[PDB]
Structure formats: structure tokens, C-alpha cells
Amino acid sequence: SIEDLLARKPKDLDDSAVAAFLKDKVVLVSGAGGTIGSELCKQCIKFGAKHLIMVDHSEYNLYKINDDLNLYKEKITPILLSILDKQSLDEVLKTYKPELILHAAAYKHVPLCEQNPHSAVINNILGTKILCDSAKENKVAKFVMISSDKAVRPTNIMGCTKRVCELYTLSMSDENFEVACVRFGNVLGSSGSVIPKFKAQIANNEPLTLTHPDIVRYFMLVAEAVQLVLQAGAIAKGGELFVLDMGKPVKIIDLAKKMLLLSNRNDLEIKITGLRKGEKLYEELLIDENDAKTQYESIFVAKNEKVDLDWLNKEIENLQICEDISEALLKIVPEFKHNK
């Protein structure tokens, strides 16, 4: 399949390192039923977590990961909950006392977030603030947030909200509460992504819709990305912004063309539809030449400075009441260049 062809096959996957990090821990995964969250759940079981707390606001998604892990039902707890509900979230943290939170709950679709920028701010920034604050207050030892190459020099509301989340979480890290963020690019076959869209077009004998002939993304298999996230969490001392080596860029036109060749469906045309608001032709390359090496060739540490939380909390209040969210986000993230 094209998945196999575009897998990274990282040479530095380290099962025993992840087992050492997770064995007998109580771990809470937010967004547990999502593409990334579900794989985080599966790997928590694989690598020996004692008790997995699965938090998701989407009932089908929660149902499905809980069903997927039914052989391990005695050590998993499905919590149907939005992380915006601080009071209920606090009760969950007190009840189960997780030692690690893996935070994979967010809205990620660039077009939808352009159309719903207030909801993007509330779900992404306020949700992350509530979950991180509750974690620190309830003495969770370590907190790892999933981030995106879209957070790097963002051109869209979504990516900018994720950058604010990096700033907030990293600024909360201290010697009692270790936070790390891990940035990576596209996961092959993820919810609502290009590969399932192309599959559904080819099945239904429809032309493939390509945004631009030159567009490029970086790709990894979900199991590869998630295990590297966990390796990064395992080595983190707190305050690190990690970045993954995604390998070679893939032109989406070559992706489309290969899917057609593999489906034996060269009868179909590829139609160009146009670059959408907020959308990059080439996402940013994640690893900077001055980033720090780790013991894993696929994982580097990027520079980040803490911001003052009094300032950032005030800006996060402003985001909730302001007339112009794009303008308000630019106050927090000076590198934001909104592609309207």
C-alpha cells in the first residue's frame, strides 16, 4: 500500500525504553479515541501501563477505543468528558491520580478552524490550559503534549492555537511538573485526511481532487510517530520542545498518482482545486540546524523560551472576549502570518 511506501521505518525505535517509562504507571490520555490518542492508548497497554484513563468527548471515538482494547478491559477506564469541564476533570484526576498525561485532544482541521476560530481558541487553548492547570494542581508528574509542524511559523488559526498551547504548557513546567511538547508532521491515514479522501474518491470512480500540483507534506505511520513521542517523553527532564525527523518530503501529486497505480485505477483524472485559506504549499522542516541531538537519531530538541504566565493568562482571557481573534493571536505569537 502507499502507507507501506511512505512509512519512515525509523531505525531508532526502542521498546524497552518506552516500557521503562510506562510500566506500572497510571496514565491518562486526553483525546483517547482520536487518531493519535487511540495509538497512544494501544501503546500504553503494550508497554505495561497499570491503568489507562481514556478521556474523550466524542462518544463513538471513546466507544471504539474501549472496544478495541476489550482484552484489557480490567485495566482501562473510559471517561466520556470534555477537558473544558474543569470541575469534572478535577474529580477524575483526584479519583485516578495519574502520574502521566498524554494530551492528544484538539481540533486540527485547518479549514474548519478558519470558519470557527472562536471554537478553535476555546477547545485548543482553553482546553489545554484547563487540562494542564488541573494536572499541575493534582500533582501529575509529567505532561506530554502532541503538537504539529503547523505550529511552526503558523499561517492558520489552527496552527497558531497549537503554538499558544506549546507556549502555555512549556511555561508551566517546573521542577515538580515536567512538561514536554513533541512536534511532528502528517500521520498517514489519519482521521479526515488526504489518503482516506483519495480512497473514497477512487472507490466511487470520482476524479481525485488535488489542491496544487506542487504541494508537499511530510509523513509518518501513526505507530512510528507515537512511539517516538513516548521515547521523547521518557527522556524528557521538563521544558523540552521536541521535534521528530520525518524523512523526505512527499509531493501530494506523486501520492495521488501512486494511489491510482496501486488501485489499478489510472482511468481516473487528477483535478486541481486550489490552495485553501490558511494552507501552506510546503510545511516547515521540523529540525533546525542548531537543534540539540538526543540519543535517538529521530528526535531533536528545539529552542524555546518560557513566557511569563501572568502575561499569557491575561492574553488568553483577552482571546475569549476580543473582536478580532486573528489580531489577538498575533499579540501572543509574533511569527503568525495569517493566510487569509
Ligand X SMILES: NC(=O)c1ccc[n+]([C@@H]2O[C@H](COP(=O)([O-])OP(=O)(O)OC[C@H]3O[C@@H](n4cnc5c(N)ncnc54)[C@H](O)[C@@H]3O)[C@@H](O)[C@H]2O)c1
Ligand Y SMILES: O=c1ccn([C@@H]2O[C@H](COP(=O)(O)OP(=O)(O)O)[C@@H](O)[C@H]2O)c(=O)[nH]1
DSSP secondary structure, 231-243, as one string = HHHHH--SSEEEE
Asked if 162 interacts with ligand Y (CB under 6 A), we say no
Beta bridge partners of 28: 53, 101
Instruction: Examine residue 6 and tell whether it contacts ligand Y (CB under 6 A).
Output: no
Q: Residue 324, interface with its own copies (CB under 8 A)? A: no
Span of 119-127, 262-270, 288-296, 329-337 interacting with its own copies by CB under 8 A: 119-127
Residue 197 binds which entry of ligand X, ligand Y, Na ion, none, with Cβ cut-offs from 5 to 8 Å by kind?
ligand Y
If the CB atoms of residues 139 and 197 are measured against its own copies, the closer one turns out to be 197
CB of 78 to its own copies, least distance (A): 6
What is the C-alpha radius of gyration for the chain, rounded to an integer number of angstroms? 20
Residue 243, C-beta contacts closer than 8 angstroms, at least 6 positions apart: 182, 183, 184, 286, 287, 291, 299, 300, 301, 302
Instruction: Indicate if 46 belongs to the active site.
Output: no
For residue 226, what is its C-alpha cell? 507515537
From the list ligand X, ligand Y, its own copies, none, pick the one residue 110 interacts with, judged by a Cβ distance below 5 to 8 Å according to partner type: ligand Y
By the rule CB under 8 A, 159 interacts with its own copies: no
191 to 220: interface string for its own copies, x by CB under 8 A:
xx----x-----------------------
In the numeric block, which cell numbers belong to residue 333? Answer: 505569537
110 contacts ligand Y (rule: CB under 6 A): yes
User: Choosing from 25, 150, 162, 280, which is the catalytic residue?
Assistant: 150
User: Does residue 191 belong to the site contacting ligand Y (CB under 6 A)?
Assistant: no
Interatomic CA distance for residues 271 and 209, integer angstroms: 5
Judged on CB neighbours under 10 Å (0-12, 13-18, 19+), 265 is: middle
Residue 122 or 330 having the CB closest to its own copies: 122
Rounded to 5 degrees, φ, ψ at 231 are: -65, -40
Which of ligand X, Na ion, ligand Y, none is residue 43 near (CB under 5 to 8 Å by kind)? none
Q: Which is nearer to ligand Y, 209 or 339 (CB)?
A: 209
Identity of the residue, 15 or 67, whose beta carbon is nearer to its own copies in the bound complex: 67
CB of 194 to ligand Y, least distance (A): 3
Q: Is the dihedral of CA 199, 200, 205, 210 positive or negative?
A: negative
As a whole number of angstroms, the distance between CA 220 and CA 10 comes to: 9
Q: Which is nearer to its own copies, 60 or 324 (CB)?
A: 60
User: What are the E-state strand segments in 72-148?
Assistant: 76-80, 100-103, 142-148
Name residues whose C-beta falls within 8 Å of residue 108's C-beta, 6 or more positions apart in sequence.
Answer: 148, 158
Please tell me whether residue 72 binds its own copies under the rule CB under 8 A.
no
Stretch that binds ligand X, among 80-88, 92-100, 228-236, 274-282 (CB under 6 A): 80-88
Considering the rule CB under 6 A, would residue 252 count as an interface residue with ligand Y? Answer: yes
Of the candidates 53, 134, 217, 234, which one interacts with ligand Y according to CB under 6 A? 217
* Residue 9, burial from CB neighbour count under 10 angstroms (0-12, 13-18, 19+): exposed
Residue 321 to residue 122: CA distance in whole angstroms: 11
Region of 8-16, 76-84, 143-151, 169-177 interacting with its own copies (CB under 8 A):
76-84
Buried b (16+ CB within 10 A) or exposed e, 102-124: bbbbbbbebeebbebbeebbbbb
The catalytic site residues sit at 150
Per CB under 8 A, residues contacting its own copies are 57-64, 66-67, 77-82, 84-85, 88, 107-109, 112-113, 115-116, 118-120, 122-123, 191-192, 197
